[PDB]
Amino acid sequence: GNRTIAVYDLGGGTFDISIIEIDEVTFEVLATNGDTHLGGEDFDSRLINYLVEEFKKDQGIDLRNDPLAMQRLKEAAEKAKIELSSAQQTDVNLPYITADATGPKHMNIKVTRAKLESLVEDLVNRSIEPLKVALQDAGLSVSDIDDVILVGGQTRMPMVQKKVAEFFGKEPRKDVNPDEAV
Ligand SMILES: Nc1ncnc2c1ncn2[C@@H]1O[C@H](COP(=O)(O)OP(=O)(O)CP(=O)(O)O)[C@@H](O)[C@H]1O
Incomplete structure (x- = not known):
């Protein structure tokens, strides 16, 4: 029963997105992208x-x-x-x-x-571009993702949550911490 997650981490300076696969039998980063000038x-x-x-x-x-x-x-x-x-x-x-x-x-x-x-609408839209790239690099689509976890204070903004929810088609979790995420 493997589980694949997406980590959307929008901080004060930079933006990161990471795709991680979890299997029981193991942890594997599948792809990572971002925007060093978007925070x-x-x-x-x-x-x-x-x-x-x-x-x-x-x-x-x-x-x-x-x-x-x-x-x-x-x-x-x-x-x-x-x-x-x-x-x-x-x-x-x-x-x-x-x-x-x-x-x-x-x-x-x-x-x-x-x-x-x-x-700020356009700044939120910029964060979706590295998302598409990461999924392509991973050979995956949004349907293959099981959970979206938000990291960073800026993600508390309702708009940022609404747009990420629209892309993945799932309600992102902002309650989850790094240990719990895995
Ligand atoms: N409730 C809230 N709504 C919107 N923005 C908020 C917020 N609370 C905090 N922030 C914003 O979150 C940012 C704090 O970011 P955080 O401490 O999580 O990461 P960071 O800036 O240290 C890492 P990096 O430089 O790599 O991106 C600040 O820009 C602050 O304005």
Whole structure:
């Protein structure tokens, strides 16, 4: 009774996919692929652009010339990205972010989940490309896979789970650890 699994591991920096076969009678990695420039940090970057554009649209300032402000906005963007894994909407609040002749300025922007999903949709789609490759290299199809286990914090995002569920046709398991997976 062999069991074949797929490990979708999306971290802060890189993306990995691995196909592993288990037999009783033994453990054999059948294929492994990924994307060295596709990670959670790219999800923050997309949200950072949106916050910079909205702050310009509203107040008229470009924060990118201000390095100390861009650090706080990166920190705030990640925080909002995470909350939006569990909430439908959230609020970025950074008082005294910058200043001009009119005085000190404040950021207060509402980000909805739907907004975030539209911003990162293409990054999620990039993760499917190495998946197809791995399966080809293994001489397998999605029907030959028995379980999909998610690894990495970024995979907690409902959208990422919905797309992986659509590819494999199975509900991926996010509860499983590395020992239990085998
Ligand atoms: N609830 C949540 N929803 C969405 N993203 C979340 C999250 N909780 C954490 N994250 C994201 O998960 C990432 C943390 O990744 P993790 O610690 O699992 O791997 P990593 O970055 O150390 C390994 P690598 O560099 O190889 O990819 C951060 O980018 C963080 O923004």
